[PDB]
A and B are shown apart, each in its own frame.
Chain A
Amino acid sequence: THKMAKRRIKITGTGKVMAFKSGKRHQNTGKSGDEIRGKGKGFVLAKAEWARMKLMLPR
């Protein structure tokens, strides 16, 4: 469904799923330094199986 497109459910070559890290996006910061670049790359696929069902056609 049209939300997950520009937001990352993103699919890879292996048909795996990219979300990364939410730790603090915009409001509520001012704590440490590696939490901030702690904005990440990483995901589990347990909830990928039903994830990309939303992104299915325009992956």
Chain B
Amino acid sequence: RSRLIARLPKRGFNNVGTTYEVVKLSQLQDLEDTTFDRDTLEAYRLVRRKNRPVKLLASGEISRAVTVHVDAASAAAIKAVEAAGGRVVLPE
């Protein structure tokens, strides 16, 4: 009860909503084939988890031609996919 657990002043607000699967650029570029990912290959590409949508963010910085279909992506990730050429699709 009273040993420094209560007496501790927090409330906050609990939600914990939508959580995206992290897909590193560093993985996608460098190795493999640029296999033209979509949502298909992700199963065998060792990105298979599911339960949640898929999201792409920039980690490793390298030039390649790549085209990735995910649910969402970041600004600098978009920038890095386009800078080395490519496209990232999103549903409406």
Measuring CB to CB, which residues of chain A are less than 8 angstroms from any residue of chain B? Answer: 3-9, 19, 21-22, 25, 47, 51, 54
B 23-52 binary contact with A (CB < 8 Å = 1; else 0): 000000000000000000000000000000
A4–B9 touching, CB < 8 Å: no
Q: Which residues of B contact A (CB under 8 A)?
A: 4-14
Cβ of A54 and Cβ of B11 under 8 Å apart?
no
A7-B8 in contact (CB<8A)? yes
A43 to nearest B CB, angstroms?
A: 10
Q: How far is the CB of A8 from chain B (nearest CB, A)?
A: 4
Pair B4/A6 contact, Cβ less than 8 Å: no
Q: How far is it, in angstroms, between the C-alpha of A8 and the C-alpha of B4 when the chains are bound?
A: 11
A51 neighbours in B (Cβ, 8 Å): 5
Interface residue from A3, A6, A47, A54 paired with B12 (Cβ < 8 Å): A6
Residues of B within 8 Å of A5, CB to CB, are 14
CB nearest to A26 among chain B residues: B9
Residue in B6, B7, B8 whose beta carbon sits within 8 Å of that of A8 in the complex: B8
